[PDB]
A paper describes a structure:
The R-type voltage-gated Ca2+ (Cav) channels Cav2.3, widely expressed in neuronal and neuroendocrine cells, represent potential drug targets for pain, seizures, epilepsy, and Parkinson’s disease. Voltage-gated calcium (Cav) channels permeate Ca2+ influx in response to the membrane depolarization. Cav2.3 channels, a ternary complex comprising the extracellular α2δ and the cytosolic β subunits in addition to the α1 subunit, are strongly expressed in the cortex, hippocampus, striatum, amygdala, and interpeduncular nucleus. The transmembrane regions of the α1 subunits all share the canonical voltage-gated ion channel fold, wherein four homologous repeats (designated I-IV), each containing six transmembrane helices (S1-S6), are interwoven in a domain-swapped manner.
Supporting the structural analysis, deletion of the entire CH2II helix (residues 773-791, the resulting mutant named ΔCH2) had no impact on channel activation, but shifted the V1/2 for the steady-state inactivation from −70.9 ± 0.1 mV to −57.3 ± 0.1 mV. Following our standard protocol, the structure of ΔCH2 was determined at an overall resolution of 3.1 Å out of 68,109 particles. In the absence of CH2II, the segments on the intracellular border of the membrane and in the cytosol, including the α1-interacting domain (AID), which is the elongated helix succeeding S6I, the cytosolic fragment of S6II, the III-IV linker and the carboxy-terminal domain (CTD), are barely discernible in the final map. We had expected that VSDII would exhibit an “up” conformation; however, it is clear that VSDII in ΔCH2 remains down, identical to that in the WT channel. Consistent with previous structural observations in Cav and Nav channels, S6II has one π-helical turn in the tightly closed WT channel, which transforms to the α conformer in the ΔCH2 structure. In the structure of ΔCH2, the S4-5II segment and its hinge with S5II undergo the most pronounced structural shift; the hinge rises towards the membrane by approximately 6 Å.
Numbering used by the authors:
A (entry chain A): 89 to 147, 158 to 177, 186 to 356, 473 to 526, 540 to 710, 1155 to 1212, 1221 to 1241, 1249 to 1429, ...
B (entry chain C): 27 to 130, 139 to 224, 232 to 540, 553 to 827, 843 to 909, 970 to 1076
């Protein structure tokens, strides 16, 4: 019957109505929202009517949902927590309307059985670091130095905690609410779990590390935070993709063709030369050439990826005609004709390879059309829930944020941003603040935690669906080696600032003898091999560069420094010496060769998107320092600045946003930064506000520009990125004894863990006494159990098991901690013993695995570091090399606030450089760091080497672009290779 | 309890002793005898009040006429110069030469002036050119500012010509509508400089006619957050542009329209009402659903009241919203069918709501549309409606060119209290052929000229009349142009809690004690008419401690040039004054010889009055070097006095001769008296002589005779007057000075009463207390009080330590009972110009409640019993004859264990009077009779959004 289609149309109309209304703060309603409320009974009338029709003949979980919805609806109009089960959940009944989406939903929910079990480990690993950080960071983040002396407030825009460090410029610190308005701190177990979880997703973890860095000291906090990123997120992300694959496993002339192929190579060059402030004659030339190309393409269409070249060529005529009658914005569709660059492979061979690639691509793309729609329905439901929860509540005294839930497009944009996982902590802070603050609004973090968990469950199932389809489309050496290590070590112990200091004084001669040994190896190898009769050329160029640097060492301030960078290649020659590292390098190179074909089409699509974005935005990203001025002519002079409640006089400057689309190269860089995922909400905010070619931006001028970023995020990161890992995997298949005592000890340690997770700040004194007494009782019980085990099992044979040895180690450490905790005259405030708390916080390390949690894991249960974890040595070498290069190049930049090169993050020291590189690899503000490490920057003062010049030359180079881009590209590629190597490790187990 | 007759006899003995000692020591009778025995070195002349008031009014009118002539010349020349301009688009080849102030660039070249030091200005000035002030937000070098500088450079010639015509001319300034101000003479500008010439009160008063502004604030839910505080700041800044001739009210609406404050109708928009409205607006919350119809109907109803006093002029509605879809066309088609009310609308905050209906209703009712997206735009967008309001004024033509005078305000360039003339300047370009009429509906700017209050004070001499007499001029609003109680400080309002913009508007009824006769006189003066009234009133002394009753004669007349009204207050015994007639140099030399400081041991320490005797004599505020300068000048300058007025000199030398001969003939006979510590005489000439030269360093009195509180107190009273010393070690003299007494010298020349001087002594406290004993009696204490309830001494020798203290601050019960039985009367006032210590939540200025006590009845004996609870307090009270002292005896307070709240008569900070009910019965005032609105020729086809 057609009675079902009428219900479907009604559901569509109700979804459209729900997508129309907006929420205003403080019981305010727009006049349009009154009309929508008028048609509440009409929509629910037939939803209650359909229940009666289906109840007189039927007497599944979807009918339950519809009944719940209608029951909540009828009770909602009698008068409000009940107006959420009938509104935000109503679009979900579209799934029950049709059986296709019902079958699709059953395909993705049947793959979560191995995923829910392994996700329990992530919660249990989060519980570890929550307890560990609770005993070390509790209540130690409540002192930030303001000292206004006039308004007893202010200070630093990011508040700087004192702890035991002391604010350098002076000041003193009274009570402080907390780092992120008192939300991101380890006060109790619930706060610690949220802080650990929000930094296991690599969002704001650096801010958390730095907040505890200047409150306790920069010595041991890295030991807590680096493993939390490595063993917390790197392993879990690897584990979920590993276990998800576990279920997956088991005209006709050639001359005319050449002419038309070369002709389309000029259409792309004509749209790739468009740039801001181009000459007017260039504009006229391109205006003529566009019409000429369109006419020629239409003529050859009349004469004659045939379908792709059909709509694209025809679309240009419509685009030119439609825009002619409306002078203004020009979206651009002509560059879509560039897809014919794929049909050029037959000339350069590998044509069949591109055919297989493109066939797999279109086959995989479609295989997700139903899952993508099912994905979008959940996005709509979550956006509606956020509107019902945070709608009209983000109107703060400082202005409403760009990521709000006031209107349906805004809520959709915010939900999409949180799903991409970028800056979701900021939106969660805003929601917590809106719902009341830390005192009463912490219940709204559940919405963002649940939504974030679905963002990973989103890409996981989409990646799984790609791989399933992709199979269907498949048919004296030691001494010379040690002298390299000594030279590499000597490369790291330098001061980039103090060019003439004792360390450099004693290191120049060390470098001289290293070069002497290297040239001895040079000279001894020119007789055995007879020159020429490969990386030996690399060794030769390194040695000749060293010789040249020595030659013109004895002008010498900037020219000679570039030659000294060549010595950072000393760790590279270790690859040839080690056969075990040579194999890993060979595997990396062959993996790059195997996947290089997809990189070509990826680059082509990136070029197309950048060309589209150049015409879409171009010179619209300019702005003036004060919002009043809208053009460069008026943006001149001085203006009064009311920012941050402080009145000041500043000069007006016509500036440009850091990341823009003026050139093709600038657009490519911006798109790459967006693809990495960092800073893309800011780019979207800048792009939405564009007004005209040479005018200042106006907020939310055109919100339709977010469609570009939605399509870009659907295509490039969500689809092309996991095509690499999927196709690499495709080319991969072919290569004491009593029961009561045992029960009590297992149950007793459960109580100790519970006792462990109840310490909290500002607890009553009697609470602390009870906690201490419980700890003492548990320690005594453990000592009694250990002495019983020793008596009944023999002292020497007691340590015959690793678990028993570990348990005995903690018990002795527990006794030592208990005795020394109270102490008396041996307080020794200097000798503050704290590391023995690790045994108390690791008792659960043994309490775990009641069954087989490890076995539940795949990479952890099966041999992890069998042989493939040898690739980890290659990543360490890359980090070392880039840290050395950064120290040598950017190591002398002057540190300042209001920039991403400062005391917390800089290149001054080797370990600071490694921390910066790790932060960039995880990805926090690597684009901002690259911006800070640019040319004409301040220079750190050189007390040594006295001279009459102060400014001399400006430190900071313009090679930061290539440096950072290449670094993160190499890091991502090596991470992908590490993942496929772990797949190597567990190949036998999964079969 | 002693008998009444015995106490009366004891009091009679004490008062007889005190009076006899004062009479025989001060030597008043000798001074009277000598004054009546000479009668030849001076003549008595009348002080006819009517002629004096007429002369002063004519002088003030002439001064304001000079200022009006200068203003007219400047305005006409500016109009003519601007009519012939070319509007060059480039100034790189033809640089503009001008001096920019506040400097320590392409398109223009600076000027380096000499900056000589010149009198009548406290700063460095240059007469060679005119300075230019450009506000921070406005950039010099743009086309508008460069064209303005080029066409306004022609005003320097007129500035110089005006200066040469009247050398006693203060700042002349032309305030451009562009934003820059060009003033002459050139002088450097005074943290962040927020000055803007378009917000100054004189510019606001010259830009447009008075208005009837009514502010509508949308307080629906959608305005909560940043836009709410933006709206609050915008409303405060908009209120800051309103003067005392405008009437304003603030309303809010969210599905219901109501007033944000206690006013309920249009109010006078003075400082108090403006502060009340600001405090009410800063405490509103956003909640509900907008309803434009209700709010607009409420505003239109409040603009059509006419029950209360209004301006009967520009009626404007300020709508502060964010956006919406409702247009409320029916409301506008109902109330203002003929469009008699302009509607100005503002869109505040960053939002994306529909601005269509807002713009439509803005520029359909002859109004304008403005946008305030941030804090920076608040200051500029809240002053631009005066361009719209001024279109009928410019369209009127020559009729709308009248010099207007502002309220007394502190000068922006640190010159003191000044008033400013004002004349608008019209864009007349294209009027030769009468074809443009498109940008000629805006004023070019406003011309202004400053008049210092010292110039007006110079035209009303006060040294020919007694210190109790004075002049004062009044406003049509009732404020005082000049008055003895007007001070160069801002008037306070509210309480100064901490966690030069406003004028000094002091009403006549707040300058001195209010009365029904005072109100009638003020009303008769405001509307403008001659008159004269003599009556009996109570006047407050200079120190806020005493109130005295005296007969006054008020003579007033209007100044014909302007709307001011001038009155002269003149008591009895002051219609005739002493004028010295003498021209022989021998007498002048023999009178001036007794003034050198070295000749003080045999004549007594002599003070001088820092009066303006002539230009070459500088006032130093030292009185140790001023006297030396004065007598050196009189021994050096020729007696003919070519440039030194001889009336003051002759008076001071005659009075010096009289005082010296009195000291030599009488005081030198008795070198020391056991009961007298110092003997002083203060005269109308301006000299105070203290017989004991030593006593000199203890004389903490103003050298000027006309500023001595005891002098006026003794002038008013017939009998002797006792002055209570200060308290809490306000200086030396608690025990080393004594109790001051005084007595006015009455003189009869030909049966005509004259009071030229006062004499008195400083009675030693020890001798008087010893005579009082003839001590530490715990059964009873006997005290002596004066007019004001101030202690002189007691019998416990513990009240004696707290000398000169209010009797209620130590024994509140007896003081309260004395007030209750109507032996003392008290009146409270408000001091709107008083420095206040900041409170909780430098120093600020706030209202202060002042109280004074004085004798109520003429009865002499007051006896009764105080009932303080389960105890009896028997007492008696007797007032000493021929003085201002009262002797009361009470029993010890220790017997009756009771203690009430202490009664304090001091500078009590306060916040009243409450202005919610003040506006219900406002004081009478007269508004301007000239209005400019509703011209048919007005364009009003330009909204605020079509231009954008
Ligand atoms: C007193 O009134 C007179 C007129 O009654 C007035 O003189 C007029 O001044 C304006 C400039 O402010 C002249 O405008 C010319 O015409 C247009 C309009 O400004 C300008 O062309 C561009 O116009 C756009 C907007 O339409 C503007 O954004 C842009 O800046 C303008 N300039 C460009 C693009 O270069 C012309 O440039 C401008 N002429 C020149 C030489 O710049 C009127 O022509 C003047 N009218 C007359 C009759 O002379 C005068 O300013 C008023 N006095 C004061 C103090 O303002
Ligand atoms: C406006 O600027 C112009 C150009 O600077 C002035 O015109 C010049 O004035 C000088 C001085 O009298 C003459 O010598 C030139 O011949 C004028 N014309 C030029 C330079 O082209 C003009 O005087 C200025 N307006 C006013 C009111 O000063
Ligand atoms: C200015 O006013 C005075 C009186 O105050 C008058 O005598 C004089 O004529 C006026 N004009 C000039 C130029 O002084
Ligand atoms: Ca991030
Ligand atoms: Ca609203």
């Amino acid at each position: 019957p057609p009675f079902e289609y009428m219900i479907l149309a009604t559901i569509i109309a109700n979804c459209i109505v729900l997508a129309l209304e907006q929420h205003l703060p403080e019981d305010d309603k727009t006049p349009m929202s009154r009309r929508l409320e008028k048609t509440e009974p009409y929509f629910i009338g037939i939803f209650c009517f359909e229940a009666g029709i289906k109840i007189v003949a039927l007497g599944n979980g979807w009918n339950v949902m519809d009944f719940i919805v209608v029951l909540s609806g009828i009770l909602a109009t009698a008068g409000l927590r009940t107006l959420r089960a009938v509104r935000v959940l109503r679009p979900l009944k579209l799934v029950s309307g049709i059986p296709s989406l019902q079958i699709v939903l059953k395909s993705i929910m049947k793959a979560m059985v191995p995923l829910l079990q392994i996700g329990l480990l992530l919660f249990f690993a989060i519980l570890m670091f929550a307890i560990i950080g609770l005993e070390f960071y509790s209540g130690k983040l409540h002192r930030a130095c303001f000292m206004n002396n006039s308004g007893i407030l202010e200070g630093f825009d990011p508040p700087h905690p004192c702890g035991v460090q002391g604010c350098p410029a002076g000041y003193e610190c009274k009570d402080w609410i907390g780092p992120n308005d008192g939300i991101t701190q380890f006060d109790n177990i619930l706060f610690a779990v949220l802080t650990v979880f929000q930094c296991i997703t690599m969002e704001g973890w650096t801010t958390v590390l730095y907040n505890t860095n200047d409150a306790l000291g920069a010595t041991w906090n890295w030991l807590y935070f680096i493993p939390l990123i490595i063993i917390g997120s790197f392993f879990v992300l690897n584990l979920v993709l590993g276990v998800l694959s576990g279920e997956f496993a088991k005209v006709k002339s050639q001359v005319f063709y050449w002419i038309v192929l070369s002709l389309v190579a000029l259409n792309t060059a004509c749209v790739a030369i468009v740039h801001h402030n181009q000459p007017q004659w260039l504009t006229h030339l391109l205006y003529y050439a566009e019409f000429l190309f369109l006419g020629l393409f239409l003529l050859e269409m009349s004469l004659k990826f045939n379908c792709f070249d059909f709509g694209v060529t025809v679309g240009s005529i419509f685009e030119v005609v439609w825009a002619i009658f409306r002078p203004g914005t020009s979206f651009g569709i002509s560059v879509l004709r560039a897809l014919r660059l794929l049909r050029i492979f037959k000339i350069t061979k590998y044509w069949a390879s591109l055919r297989n690639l493109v066939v797999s691509l279109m086959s995989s793309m479609k295989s997700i059309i139903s899952l993508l729609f099912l994905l979008f329905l959940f996005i709509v439901v979550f956006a509606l829930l956020g509107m019902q929860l945070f709608g009209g509540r983000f109107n703060f005294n400082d202005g409403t944020p760009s990521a709000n839930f006031d209107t349906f497009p805004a809520a959709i944009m915010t939900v999409f941003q949180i799903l991409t996982g970028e800056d979701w902590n900021e939106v969660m802070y805003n929601g917590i603040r809106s719902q009341g603050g830390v005192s009463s609004g912490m219940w709204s973090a559940i919405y963002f935690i649940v939504l974030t968990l679905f963002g990973n469950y989103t890409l996981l199932n989409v990646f799984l669906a790609i791989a399933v389809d992709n199979l269907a489309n498949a048919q004296f050496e030691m001494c010379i080696l040690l002298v390299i290590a000594a030279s590499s070590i000597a490369l790291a112990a330098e001061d980039p600032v103090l060019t003439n200091s004792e360390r450099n004084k004693v290191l120049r001669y060390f470098d001289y003898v290293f070069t002497g040994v290297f040239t001895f190896e040079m000279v001894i190898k020119m007789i055995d091999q007879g020159l020429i009769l490969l990386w030996n050329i690399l060794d030769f160029v390194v040695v000749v560069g060293a010789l040249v640097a020595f030659a013109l060492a004895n002008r010498d301030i900037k020219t000679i420094k570039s030659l000294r960078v060549l010595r950072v290649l000393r760790p590279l020659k270790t690859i040839k010496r080690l056969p075990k590292l040579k194999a890993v390098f060979d595997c990396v190179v062959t993996s790059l060769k195997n996947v290089f074909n997809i990189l070509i089409v990826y680059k082509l699509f990136m070029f197309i998107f950048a060309v589209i974005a150049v015409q879409l935005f171009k010179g619209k990203f300019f702005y003036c320092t004060d919002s009043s001025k809208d053009t460069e002519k008026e943006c001149i002079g001085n203006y009064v600045d009311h920012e941050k409640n402080k009145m000041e006089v500043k000069g007006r400057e016509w500036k440009r946003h850091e990341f823009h689309y003026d050139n093709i190269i600038w657009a490519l860089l911006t798109l790459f930064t967006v693809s990495t995922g960092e800073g893309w909400p800011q780019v979207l905010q800048h792009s939405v506000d564009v007004t005209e070619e040479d005018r200042g931006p106006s907020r939310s001028n055109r919100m339709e520009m977010s469609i570009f970023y939605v399509v870009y995020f659907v295509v490039f990161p969500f689809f092309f990125v996991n095509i690499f890992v999927a196709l690499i995997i495709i080319t991969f298949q072919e290569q004491v004894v009593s029961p009561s005592f045992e029960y009590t000890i297992m149950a007793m340690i459960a109580l100790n863990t519970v006792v462990l997770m109840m310490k909290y700040y500002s607890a009553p004194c009697t609470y602390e006494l009870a906690l201490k007494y419980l700890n003492i009782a548990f320690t005594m019980v453990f000592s009694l159990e250990c002495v019983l085990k020793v008596i009944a099992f023999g002292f020497l044979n007691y340590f015959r098991d690793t678990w028993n040895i570990f348990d005995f180690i903690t018990v002795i450490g527990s006794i030592t901690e208990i005795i020394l905790t109270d102490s008396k005259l041996v307080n020794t405030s200097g000798f503050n013993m704290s590391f023995l708390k690790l045994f108390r916080a690791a008792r659960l390390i043994k309490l775990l695995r009641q069954g087989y949690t490890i076995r539940i894991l795949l990479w952890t249960f099966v041999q992890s570091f069998k042989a493939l974890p040898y690739v980890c040595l290659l990543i360490a070498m890359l980090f070392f090399i880039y840290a050395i290069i950064g120290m040598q190049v950017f190591g002398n930049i002057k540190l300042d606030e209001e920039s991403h090169i400062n005391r917390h993050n800089n290149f001054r020291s080797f370990f600071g450089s490694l921390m910066l590189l790790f932060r960039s690899a995880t990805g926090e503000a690597w684009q901002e760091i690259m911006l800070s490490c640019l040319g004409e920057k301040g220079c750190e003062p050189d007390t040594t080497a006295p001279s009459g010049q102060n400014e001399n030359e400006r430190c900071g180079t313009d090679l930061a672009y290539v440096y950072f881009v290449s670094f993160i590209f190499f890091c991502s590629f090596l991470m992908l290779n590490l993942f496929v190597a772990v797949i190597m490790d567990n190949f036998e187990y999964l079969t | 309890f002693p008998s009444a007759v015995t106490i009366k006899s004891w009091v009679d003995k004490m008062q007889e002793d005190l009076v006899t000692l004062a009479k025989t020591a001060s030597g008043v009778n000798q001074l009277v005898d000598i004054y009546e025995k000479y009668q030849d070195l001076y003549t008595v002349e009348p002080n006819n009040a009517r002629q004096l008031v007429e002369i002063a009014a004519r002088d003030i009118e002439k001064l304001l006429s000079n200022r009006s002539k200068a203003l007219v010349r400047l305005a006409l020349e500016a109009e003519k110069v601007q009519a012939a301009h070319q509007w060059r688009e480039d100034f790189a080849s033809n640089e503009v030469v001008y001096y920019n102030a506040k400097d320590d660039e392409p398109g223009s070249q600076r000027i380096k002036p000499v900056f000589i030091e010149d009198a009548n200005f406290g700063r460095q000035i240059s007469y060679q050119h005119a300075a230019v002030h450009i506000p921070t937000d406005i950039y010099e070098g743009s086309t508008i500012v460069l064209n303005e500088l080029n066409w306004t450079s022609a005003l320097d010639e007129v500035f110089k010509k005006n200066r040469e015509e009247d050398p006693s001319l203060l700042w002349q300034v032309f305030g451009s509508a562009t934003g820059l101000a060009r003033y002459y003479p050139a002088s450097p500008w005074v943290k962040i400089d927020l000055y803007d010439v378009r917000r100054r009160p004189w510019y606001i008063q010259g830009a447009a006619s008075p208005k009837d502004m009514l502010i509508l604030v949308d307080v629906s839910g959608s305005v909560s957050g940043l836009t709410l505080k933006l709206i609050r700041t915008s409303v405060s800044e908009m209120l800051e542009t309103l003067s005392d001739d405008d009437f304003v009210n603030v309303a809010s609406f969210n599905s219901n329209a109501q007033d944000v404050s206690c006013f309920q109708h249009l109010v006078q928009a003075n400082v108090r009402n403006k502060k009340v409205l600001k405090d009410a607006v800063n405490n509103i919350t956003a909640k509900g659903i907008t309803d434009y119809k209700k709010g607009f109907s409420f505003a239109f109803e409040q603009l059509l009241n006419y029950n209360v006093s209004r301006a009967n002029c520009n009626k404007i509605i300020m709508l502060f919203t964010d956006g919406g879809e409702e247009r409320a066309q029916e409301i506008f088609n109902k109330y203002n069918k003929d469009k008699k009310v302009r509607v100005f609308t503002f869109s505040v905050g960053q939002h994306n709501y529909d601005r269509g209906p807002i713009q439509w209703m803005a520029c359909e009712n002859k109004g304008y549309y403005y946008e305030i997206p941030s804090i920076g735009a608040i200051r500029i967008n809240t002053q631009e409606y005066l361009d719209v309001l001024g279109r009928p004024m410019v369209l009127a033509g020559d009729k709308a060119k009248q010099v207007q005078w502002t309220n007394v305000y502190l000068d922006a360039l640190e010159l003191g209290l000044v008033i400013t003339g004002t004349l608008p300047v019209f864009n007349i370009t294209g009027q030769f052929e009468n074809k443009t009429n498109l940008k000629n509906q805006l004023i070019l700017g406003v011309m202004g000229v400053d008049v210092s209050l010292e110039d007006i004070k110079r035209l009303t001499p006060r040294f020919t009349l007694c210190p109790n007499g004075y002049y004062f001029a009044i406003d049509p609003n009732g404020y005082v142009l000049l008055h003895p109680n007007l001070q160069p400080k801002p008037i306070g309002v509210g309480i100064p809690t901490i966690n030069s913009q406003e004028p000094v508007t002091l009403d006549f009824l707040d300058a001195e004690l209010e009365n029904d006769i005072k109100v009638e006189i003020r009303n008769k003066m405001i509307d403008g008419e001659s008159g004269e009234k003599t009556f009996r009133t109570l006047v407050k002394s200079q120190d806020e401690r005493y109130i005295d009753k005296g007969n006054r004669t008020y003579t007033w007349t209007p100044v014909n040039g302007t709307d001011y009204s001038l009155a002269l207050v003149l008591p009895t015994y002051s219609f005739y004054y002493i004028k010295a007639k003498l021209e022989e140099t021998i007498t002048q030399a023999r009178y001036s010889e007794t003034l050198k400081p070295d000749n003080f041991e045999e004549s007594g320490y002599t003070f001088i009055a820092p009066r303006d005797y002539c230009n070459d004599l500088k006032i130093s505020d030292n009185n140790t070097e001023f006297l030396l300068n004065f007598n050196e000048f009189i021994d050096r300058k020729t007696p003919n006095n070519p440039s030194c007025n001889a009336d003051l000199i002759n008076r001071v030398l005659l009075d010096a001769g009289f005082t010296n001969e009195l000291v030599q003939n009488y005081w030198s006979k008795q070198k020391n008296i056991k009961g007298v510590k110092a003997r002083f005489v203060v005269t109308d000439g301006g000299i105070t002589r203290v017989y004991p030269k030593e006593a000199g360093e203890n004389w903490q009195e103003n050298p000027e005779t006309y500023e001595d509180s005891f002098y006026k107190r003794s002038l008013d009273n017939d009998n002797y007057v006792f002055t209570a010393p200060y308290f809490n070690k306000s200086g030396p003299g608690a025990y080393e000075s004594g109790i001051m007494v005084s007595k006015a010298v009455e003189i009869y020349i030909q049966g005509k009463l004259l009071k030229p001087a006062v004499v008195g002594i400083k009675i030693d406290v020890n001798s008087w207390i010893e005579n009082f004993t003839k001590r530490n009696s715990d059964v009873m204490d006997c005290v002596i009080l004066d007019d004001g309830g101030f202690l002189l001494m007691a019998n416990h020798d513990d009240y004696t330590n707290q000398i000169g203290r209010f009797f209620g601050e130590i024994d509140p019960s007896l003081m309260r009972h004395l007030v209750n039985i109507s032996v003392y009367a008290f009146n409270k006032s408000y001091d709107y110009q008083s420095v206040c210590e900041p409170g909780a939540a430098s120093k600020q200025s706030c209202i202060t409640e002042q109280t004074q006590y004085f004798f109520d009845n003429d009865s002499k004996s007051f006896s009764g019993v105080l009932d303080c609870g389960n105890c009896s307090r028997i007492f008696h009270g007797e007032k000493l004859m021929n003085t201002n002292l009262i002797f009361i005896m009470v029993e010890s307070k220790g017997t009756c264990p009771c203690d009430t709240r202490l009664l304090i008569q001091a500078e009590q900070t306060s916040d009243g009077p409450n202005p919610c009910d003040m506006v219900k019965q406002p004081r009478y005032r007269k508004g301007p009779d000239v209005c400019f609105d509703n011209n048919v020729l007005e364009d009003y086809t330009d909204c605020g959004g079509v231009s954008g």
